Design brief:
7% of the residues lie in helices and 33% in strands. It is built from two helices and 26 strands. The strands form seven sheets. The protein has a four-stranded antiparallel beta sheet with strand order 1-26-25-24, with no helix packed on it. Helix 1 packs antiparallel against helix 2. The two termini are 25 Å apart. The structure holds one DNA strand of 145 nucleotides.
Length: 365
DNA sequence: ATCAATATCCACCTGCAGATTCTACCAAAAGTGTATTTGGAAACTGCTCCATCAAAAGGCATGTTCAGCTGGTTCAGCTGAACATGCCTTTTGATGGAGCAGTTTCCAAATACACTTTTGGTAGAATCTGCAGGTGGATATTGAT
């Protein structure tokens, strides 16, 4: 609610219609408007349970109300809102086959890629049929951790708990599996505006920017950014120019195109890591310069706000400070994951044993 | 309330197998030296193990009913303690005679050192099979009436 200097929306809109004022000023004002209306999301719309804990989340890119989610026990759910047709389910071993990475297929929306603790990077349908296994550990106590895909390049990529990343085509053709790190890789991600430089994060207190076509020589990498603590995720923006990274103790950093090494800014925020808790992953908003993250208080962290609850915090990217706080009782669990729709009208949250939807207010005639 | 009557304890005494100590003989304990091998400081490395302390399933802390134990009481019948009284085995010394423990000695044969050759046991990859779980059906079990 509390917001900084800004005014004259209809004025700015007409000035844009005249060509006087540039578009980004309007974009700033409307980012402010979106946060303002986000302060009226307070009425939590929907809750959804199933069995063992949620571990990974993904949005159907084309459709707003549908979402896919993967559990701690190999349990996948596909769920649509306003349908009430008893959502789609598939079970797994339930104990040690925790899926941990999940993105939709841009081609066949009723498919999905997945990375499992069983040691099986697979591509499987929501109907149960395993389409194709992509890799394998072939030795237990060695499993996969990370996964992503790109369509413009037609590439698939996935990371391990030991330090090596794999890169395949949609029809196999594996020319990769060189080692990148010495320990587990939490997240990996591809650029949207270009197609052939990559980002990876790990427990090594380092996050790495790669050139997936040019480097082949066992740590002849392109760039390496250090950290004070491990990193749970490093995710690109949709514009491709601002890279977000998130630690385990208390930090977020924004790196630019210009000198990947040096940082533009650091966004301190506590999301302290824990064993049985699902690891925390900050995320962009696809069409603004906002960031949305879940909080996990630490009594020792120097809080700027005087009220410290298990809240969902939102920030502006290119400034550093906050603009909104989501909270709803009956949901005092801790939203490990939070992801806005690529559409831009709906938000999904993953708490322990719960999936939540935070949509906007329904008005009265 | 006392008294009769057993058994034991406390004090003194005298004489003896065991205690002790003194004495002669000695293989074992300390000296001395060389030869050979060993804990322990330093480094390395890679398995295993404690710090952290959300959130739900399900086990436990509480509270209730009432049904079988426990633990008091009673008492009739059976028994071990006490004891007499007698008497057969055990003791214990003594002796006398046969076997065995140990003590020596010699010696073929049982056995350790050590060189060298092969190979059963181990371990990591590769394949299989059957206990778990599941599901359903037919029998057994159990308590109110």
């Amino acid at each position: 609610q509390i917001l900084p200097p800004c005014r004259s929306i209809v004025r700015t809109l007409h000035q844009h219609k005249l060509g006087r004022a540039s578009w980004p000023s309007v974009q700033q004002g409307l980012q402010q408007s979106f946060l303002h209306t986000l302060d009226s999301y307070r009425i939590l719309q929907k809750a959804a349970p199933f069995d063992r804990r949620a571990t990974s989340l993904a949005w159907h890119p084309t459709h707003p109300s549908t979402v896919a989610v993967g559990s701690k026990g190999g349990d996948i759910m596909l769920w649509n809102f306003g349908i009430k047709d008893k959502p789609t389910f598939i079970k797994g071993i339930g104990a040690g086959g925790s899926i941990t990475g999940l993105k939709f297929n841009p081609l066949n929306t009723n498919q999905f890629y997945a990375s499992s603790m069983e040691g099986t990077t697979r591509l499987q349908d929501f109907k149960g049929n395993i389409l194709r296994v992509f890799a394998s550990s072939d030795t237990i106590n060695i499993w996969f951790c990370s996964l992503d895909v790109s369509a413009s390049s037609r590439m698939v990529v996935t990371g391990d708990n030991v330090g090596n990343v794999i890169l395949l085509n949609m029809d196999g053709k594996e020319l990769w599996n060189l080692r990148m790190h010495k320990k587990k890789v939490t997240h990996v991600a591809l650029n949207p505006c270009c197609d052939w430089f990559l980002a990876t994060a790990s427990v090594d207190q380092t996050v790495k920017i790669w050139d997936l076509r040019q480097v082949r020589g066992k740590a002849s990498f392109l760039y390496s950014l250090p950290h004070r603590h491990p990193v749970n995720a490093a995710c690109f923006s949709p514009d491709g120019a601002r890279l977000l990274t998130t630690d385990q103790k208390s930090e977020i950093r924004v790196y630019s195109a210009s000198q990947w090494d040096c940082p533009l800014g650091l966004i301190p925020h506590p999301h302290r890591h824990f064993q049985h808790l699902t690891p925390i992953k900050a995320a962009w908003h696809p069409r603004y310069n906002l960031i949305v993250v879940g909080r996990y208080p630490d009594p020792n962290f120097k809080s700027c706000t005087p009220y410290e609850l298990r809240t969902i915090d939102v920030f502006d990217g290119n400034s550093g400070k906050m603009m909104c706080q989501l909270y709803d009782p009956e949901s005092s669990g801790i939203s490990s994951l939070n992801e806005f729709n690529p559409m831009g009208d709906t938000l999904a949250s993953a708490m322990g044993y719960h999936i939540l939807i935070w949509s906007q207010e329904e008005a009265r005639t």
